[PDB]
Amino acid sequence: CDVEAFTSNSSNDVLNAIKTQGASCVNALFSAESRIQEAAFESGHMYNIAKHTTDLAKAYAGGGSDELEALFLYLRAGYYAEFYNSKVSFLSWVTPAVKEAVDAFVNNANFYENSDPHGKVLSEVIITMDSAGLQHAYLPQVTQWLTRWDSQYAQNWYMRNAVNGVFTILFGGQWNEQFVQTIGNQTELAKALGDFALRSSAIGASDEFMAANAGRELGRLTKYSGSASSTVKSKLTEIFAQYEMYGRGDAIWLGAADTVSYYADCSDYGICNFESQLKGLVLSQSYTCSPTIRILSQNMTQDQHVAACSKMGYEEGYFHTSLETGRQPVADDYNTQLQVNIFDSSDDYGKYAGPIFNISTNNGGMYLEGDPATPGNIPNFVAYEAPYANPDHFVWNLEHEYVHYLDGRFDLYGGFGHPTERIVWWSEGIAEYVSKENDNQAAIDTIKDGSTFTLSEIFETSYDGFDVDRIYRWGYLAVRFMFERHKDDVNQMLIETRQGNWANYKATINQWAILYQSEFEQWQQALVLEHH
């Protein structure tokens, strides 16, 4: 790969770079520095490359095409950069040339071929329909792909990738005025989408995730009105009857229930309040560690429950001793017993945790402190098991996340959003320090690499840009430093955070950043030298 070759003023140079370097090298342009994106995705390049792609796509004879894979990838990479990079903006004559190229591939007699090589290029064409804002333009093709799909197509990884792209088109179409104006009249699309979701062959198969996506996009169609409305409703009713919320086909049932509940009236489908029933079915095990921790879980062994309770119990004691709490919570906090809700896998978490807890699940779990003053508030840590989580409980992120409950109830006044000063360094630093104690090789390593942060910088850390090195490793280092060298100061700070005096908290740690920077560096030096 040579990313600089894509920066030439000559469109032929750029075309040649696409063709010779191929898709794996074009990948770099999605992430490249702005200078490269601005030069690779000039309007003239997008237009000239699309025009070349049109001719090549017309000539395509099936069996895959490395060049067309790379060319369509490049075109939709341009729309990616145009979205995120304020210095990349297309003139109005770009997208019609791109639409012409997609048309050429769509109208090719080979468009519906079933093969992995064809799927590699077909995938990038289908995603370009979304990236280029052409969600309104290929609904008959979306419909054909939904109805043609079968067990033979489903054998091929890249055909699964490609046809799964039609759900990306449907989702992105919400922002496309022509799409929103026509989608509600697409009765054949609605029937094919519903019948795709109802394919019993998908259950337990490599394409189940596609059927679940189809059920979700079908439920989303209830937000539109038109001649397809009765078909959408009929097919959703069939999904809710054929499958169930916990059991065979529940990924499709729950996918559809998610969007139906949000965009339509749950009572038209008989699924109102399904989330609470679902909770009792999925989180069917209850194991009370103690008055301060209770586990609800899907499928843990007794040994795992015992291990989780004793690990948390050890951290709980270490926390209260280290933070000198006297086991007295902050005021206006009645989060007396943490509920630890553990699904059997990340897959299960992504399927069930969303509706049960009203959360996004594109993550590794989360602790929900809620509003600690409100009667009936429930503190919920939501998590899953994983093969490479910590023995012997094998609950992903358990030891770190558990400290957030303790820090929230005994150190930080109010709910999660109460602070009016930045506190990420403390929250994540204390979660790391209590859970890992002095065993943190990654923290030593980030000193050794010579790139560091001052205390001033650490205290300003935010989640924006998610610098995990800064947030977790340098947060840990500042916290550990303060506990080892200035514990009296930490106690002074906690007087303010425990009452919600965030301005006083800021003034307190502002003094630390002025006074202690050279000692912080000396302490880092000693830590590194100990390692050597």
């Binding site: 799964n164 594109n362 993550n363 590794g364 989360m366 992120n397 995990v468």
Partner: peptide, 14 residues
């Protein structure tokens, strides 16, 4: 919102 064919198990918490 639709899922890709592969999703990551070992993520940071939200």
């Amino acid at each position: 919102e639709p899922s890709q064919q592969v999703t990551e198990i070992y993520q940071h918490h939200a």
